[PDB]
Amino acid sequence: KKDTQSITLEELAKIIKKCKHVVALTGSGTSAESNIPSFRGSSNSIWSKYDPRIYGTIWGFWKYPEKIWEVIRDISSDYEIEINNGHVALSTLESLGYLKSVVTQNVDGLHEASGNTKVISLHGNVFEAVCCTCNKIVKLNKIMLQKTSHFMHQLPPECPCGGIFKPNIILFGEVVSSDLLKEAEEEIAKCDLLLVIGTSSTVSTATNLCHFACKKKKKIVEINISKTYITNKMSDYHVCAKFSELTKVANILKGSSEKNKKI
Amino acid sequence: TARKSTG
Ligand SMILES: [Zn+2]
Numbered sequence A: 001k002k003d004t005q006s007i008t009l010e011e012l013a014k015i016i017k018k019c020k021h022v023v024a025l026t027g028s029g030t031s032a033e034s035n036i037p038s039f040r041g042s043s044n045s046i047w048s049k050y051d052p053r054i055y056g057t058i059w060g061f062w063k064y065p066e067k068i069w070e071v072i073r074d075i076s077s078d079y080e081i082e083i084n085n086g087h088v089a090l091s092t093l094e095s096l097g098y099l100k101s102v103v104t105q106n107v108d109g110l111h112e113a114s115g116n117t118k119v120i121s122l123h124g125n126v127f128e129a130v131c132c133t134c135n136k137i138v139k140l141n142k143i144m145l146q147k148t149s150h151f152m153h154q155l156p157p158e159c160p161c162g163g164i165f166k167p168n169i170i171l172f173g174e175v176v177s178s179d180l181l182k183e184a185e186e187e188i189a190k191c192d193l194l195l196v197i198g199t200s201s202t203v204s205t206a207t208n209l210c211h212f213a214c215k216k217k218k219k220i221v222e223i224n225i226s227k228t229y230i231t232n233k234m235s236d237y238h239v240c241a242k243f244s245e246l247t248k249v250a251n252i253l254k255g256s257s258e259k260n261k262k263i
Numbered sequence B: 001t002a003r004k005s006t007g
Helices: A009-017 A058-063 A065-078 A085-095 A178-189 A204-215 A243-255
Strands: A022-026 A099-104 A119-121 A124-131 A137-139 A165-169 A193-197 A220-224 A237-240
Touching: A009 A220, A009 A237, A009 A243, A022 A204, A058 A065, A065 A165, A085 A099, A085 A243, A099 A178, A119 A178, A178 A204, A193 A204, A204 A220
Parallel strands: A022 A099, A022 A193, A099 A119, A193 A220, A220 A237
Antiparallel strands: A124 A137, A124 A165
């Protein structure tokens, strides 16, 4: 419980200029302008064909294991999914020596695709699959998630051993890997600014990490299109902005990096 | 227990 202040992007550029070890905590809002809706209750979207009480939960996987595959398949097949300007900005911010890692709840792989080098995926990742009898791992790529791939032909996909593949993502009701959390915790432990970008409503995961960042008396900035659970509880500043307006921050920091010519 | 849960 505490008093959050509104700041501009220009002003965030200045906060980041002083900093040696910035961390970004990212939620679905950073994939929205890549064409995947965060609302999730929108009817202008995919989440609509499918009951989130079934595909979203581990009870739902064991009863209807085809359903989370259908959802991943239709999102991959039916939408143009590309790195946006926000992802490019974060990649620059790493390049310039500011951003040390990204802790994320998205499962879509975009931060890596943009060139980030230390992405901690707390909810896992849609490009691997595990057999939930023998634990054989299978690596996948975008092209294998298409509706026409052999791997999608019969759902849920089947291991040679006779078991069934499960995506390697953490569903509601499951437990986030303690190792991955300790990783995220230590990256926060050493940081001097946490950027919390595109997150809600929340989920226990991001929240617990912000609590941890307060415990460690760390400086927190939200970049969001709106107030969130942690505004006025845990964030020190808040920037009202879309993930991709972040290239303005990257611009200000790159051109100041051109204090580079002699004299 | 760090269960993924709805906030
Ligand atoms: Zn198997």
